[PDB]
Design an enzyme around this catalytic site. Structure first.
Site, PDB file in Angstrom:
ATOM      1  N   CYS A  51       3.716   1.283   9.804  1.00 34.70           N
ATOM      2  CA  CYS A  51       3.466   0.340   8.722  1.00 34.70           C
ATOM      3  C   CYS A  51       4.785  -0.168   8.154  1.00 34.70           C
ATOM      4  O   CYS A  51       5.658   0.619   7.777  1.00 34.70           O
ATOM      5  CB  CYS A  51       2.634   1.003   7.625  1.00 34.70           C
ATOM      6  SG  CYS A  51       1.057   1.681   8.192  1.00 34.70           S
ATOM      7  N   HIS A  64       0.808  -1.213   0.000  1.00 38.49           N
ATOM      8  CA  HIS A  64       0.000   0.000   0.000  1.00 38.49           C
ATOM      9  C   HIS A  64       0.845   1.267   0.000  1.00 38.49           C
ATOM     10  O   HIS A  64       0.301   2.359   0.198  1.00 38.49           O
ATOM     11  CB  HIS A  64      -0.967   0.005   1.191  1.00 38.49           C
ATOM     12  CG  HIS A  64      -0.298   0.069   2.529  1.00 38.49           C
ATOM     13  ND1 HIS A  64       0.321   1.207   3.001  1.00 38.49           N
ATOM     14  CD2 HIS A  64      -0.172  -0.860   3.507  1.00 38.49           C
ATOM     15  CE1 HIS A  64       0.810   0.973   4.206  1.00 38.49           C
ATOM     16  NE2 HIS A  64       0.524  -0.274   4.536  1.00 38.49           N
ATOM     17  N   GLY A 124       3.278   5.797  11.188  1.00 36.01           N
ATOM     18  CA  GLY A 124       4.466   5.406  10.456  1.00 36.01           C
ATOM     19  C   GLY A 124       4.949   4.005  10.767  1.00 36.01           C
ATOM     20  O   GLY A 124       5.985   3.573  10.253  1.00 36.01           O
TER      21      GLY A 124
END
Lengths: 301, 301
Positions: free
Chosen positions: B145, B41, B143
């Site tokens: 991810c 993503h 952040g």
């Protein structure tokens, strides 16, 4: 989102974990530059641990009696010394993986990350807290002696603890990286009193503040309270008396949440007078006191 | 002595934490050998996250659109690919700090250590557990991810998780290091059901076993129970049905403590039917289900 017990990355501390053998005792050591720091009770056998004159025992021990192994290498002890209750073994090779470090002594209540090690190799990391009675409820076995507790500020790893012994009470005690013990504990095998462990109120309020940031708001009340009468309730439940300086510490947490710090002390009053009646503040049916307000800000950013 | 939430040393995983920028999105990446693994993503903006056709969006993105920085260096993406829900960015330089790794998919209930990272730099480590509903209650911000969950077996770091998204329920979801999601979650911005999270019974019994090893014995009872009728009580409190294979898992814990596993199921029966009435099993007024029996053996050695 989320909030839980989090510890600093142990990578910069793993590179300084050596195994110091002095005959029959095997414990861990801190290799910074060309000095290996280990608990001084490595020169004690087992029956010597009850009444040890470390000055005399250190006289019998020579330099070649200390065996320092960093993984599978070997460092030559070219000088043995004893700073208070720690041993500073001067070795030949300087550790190339020495991070920017500083020896700091923490205050009762502050938290730190402990890297537990056995036979010199690290085993795990967990976030502890220097309890008001200067004890530490951690996970230390027979070989965990010598493990260090560190906080990582920016790119500087600040060592602040070194495990020394396991009290018969079940908790643990240690010293800073200079040699002075935390609390009224000595490196002997005698019965030593830990004292009544009180609850860190300034840390509990910071834990309650993070609960509002994450969604737990049931403990919030419509009442307020004073800074004095809250202590009168807090001193009965063996809670640390909240100071005005601690109110300043919870400043940003009071700003980001919109709840005044004195209004949080009134909610804690009902949490102690009327109990929790079974709930899940962030996931615990009790109140956590091992979360400093800095840990709440650095995590619930 | 002692027992608490402990995580693996993050040193071998810190050396593989890179920051992958694809325009406006900044997330972390796993640099093993010459391949950088990041959530796919990163090619989605913000409005694309609601209905993303990753095949079409990946077509628009070229190799030079992925910026990988390991601290302050730069890796050239000489090949972009998408394995299921993860992106495998082939880079030029091979990571010299690549530990012995393996991509493994864990079972619902097993625990792992998550190294949370922001802007590529690690921030903290905590021991999570893959809940039965394949969710994870952790600490992930905007952040986080790309952070990975790993177990370190001997000298082999087994990566088993990668944070992908934060569900609107509050918990988190991710995937293994191959690309397949854990549970019925997809990398979109739609309302996805997490499901009823049940309690890991085999892990709670291992947590109760460690309590006897450390000194908490109040929950121990004189009664016994059967493996079937305990489930009939456990299934009502949304506990995972204990199997005979799980009884074999608690074998060494039943041996070292001297308490049979079926006698532990009878004590848990009273802990649910009659409650705890407020106590401190190892330090919690609730029952912990994020401790696998291997974690109890490896810690309470």
């Amino acid at each position: 989102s989320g909030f839980r017990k989090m510890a600093f990355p142990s990578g910069k501390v793993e590179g300084c974990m050596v195994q110091v053998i002095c005959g029959t005792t095997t414990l861990n050591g801190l290799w910074l530059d060309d000095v290996v720091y280990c608990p001084r009770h490595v020169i004690c056998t087992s029956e010597d641990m009850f009444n040890p004159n470390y000055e005399d025992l250190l006289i019998r021990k020579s330099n070649h009696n200390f065996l320092v192994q960093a993984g599978n290498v070997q460092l030559r002890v070219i000088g043995h010394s004893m700073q208070n209750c720690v041993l500073k073994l001067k070795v030949d090779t300087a550790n190339p993986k020495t991070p920017k470090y500083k020896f700091v002594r923490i205050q009762p209540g502050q938290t730190f990350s402990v890297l537990a090690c056995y036979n010199g190799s690290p085993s795990g990391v967990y976030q502890c807290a220097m309890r008001p009675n200067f004890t530490i409820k951690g996970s230390f076995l027979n070989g965990a002696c010598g493990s260090v507790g560190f906080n990582i500020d920016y790119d500087c790893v600040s060592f602040c603890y070194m495990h020394h012994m396991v009290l018969p009470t079940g908790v643990h005690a240690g010293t800073d990286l200079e040699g002075n013990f935390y609390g009224p504990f000595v490196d002997r095998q005698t019965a030593q009193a830990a004292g009544t462990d009180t609850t860190i109120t300034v840390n509990v309020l910071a834990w309650l503040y993070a609960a509002v940031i994450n969604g737990d708001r049931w403990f919030l009340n419509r009442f307020t309270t004073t800074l004095n009468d809250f202590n009168l309730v807090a001193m009965k439940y063996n809670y640390e008396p909240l100071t005005q300086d601690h109110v300043d510490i919870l400043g940003p947490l009071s700003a980001q949440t919109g709840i005044a710090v004195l209004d949080m002390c009134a909610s804690l009053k009902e949490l102690l007078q009327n109990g929790m009646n079974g709930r899940t503040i962030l996931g615990s049916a009790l109140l956590e006191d091992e979360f400093t307000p800095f840990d709440v800000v650095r995590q619930c950013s």
